[PDB]
Amino acid sequence: RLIEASLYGGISSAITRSLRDYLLPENSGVRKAFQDMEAALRENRITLE
Amino acid sequence: SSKSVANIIRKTIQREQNRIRMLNQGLQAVSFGQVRGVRLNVNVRESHAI
Amino acid sequence: VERDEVAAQKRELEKQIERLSQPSGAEDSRMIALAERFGGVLLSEIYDD
């Protein structure tokens, strides 16, 4: 998308729609703590099912 | 719990805002016809701010 | 006996994984609160990048 938008030129519609998806990096720190803390419950629930 | 999570979220938000602000300065005073500058405007949604 | 020995290895592996989790993997049990209770920042977090 980046390359071809540059090739034809103009304000790309697709880039404009998903602006946050392109310009912001995804951060794992906020998440993995809670995945590990959540683990004991997840396993228990799956076992019960 | 609680406050510490809020602090890490706030610091991440602050760092992203600052980096964007740095990128933003490189684009000042670019002349394209009648356009004279470009910016990436970053804001925080209310429903999440509260 | 084989079951229990493998269980011991699995417990060690989870404990090792868990130490590397969050927020910037460290002795997270108390260190996060200790980091904010003074006007300071965790060194390992400064060297995250």
- Residue B30's H or E segment, with its range, is strand B28-32
Do B9 and A27 make contact, defined as CB atoms within 8 angstroms? Answer: no
- The resolution in Å comes to 9.1
- Residue B28's H or E segment, with its range, is strand B28-32
Do B8 and C23 make contact, defined as CB atoms within 8 angstroms? Answer: yes
**Deposited experimental method:** cryo-EM
Distance from CA of C32 to the nearest CA of B (A): 8
- State the helix-helix crossing angle for A29-48 and B3-25, rounded to 10 degrees: 140
d(CA A9, CA A27): 31
Please count the other Cβ atoms lying within 10 Å of the Cβ belonging to residue B9.
13
Distance from CA of B50 to the nearest CA of C (A): 22
C21 near A32, Cβ under 8 Å?
yes
DSSP category for residue C35 = H
Q: Identify the bridge partners of residue B28 per DSSP, sorted by sequence position.
A: B37
Q: Residue holding tokens 């990436």?
A: B40
For chain B, what percentages of helix, strand and coil (3-state, to nearest 5) are there?
A: 55, 15, 30
Among candidates C13, B22, A35, B3, which has minimal Cα distance to B40?
B22
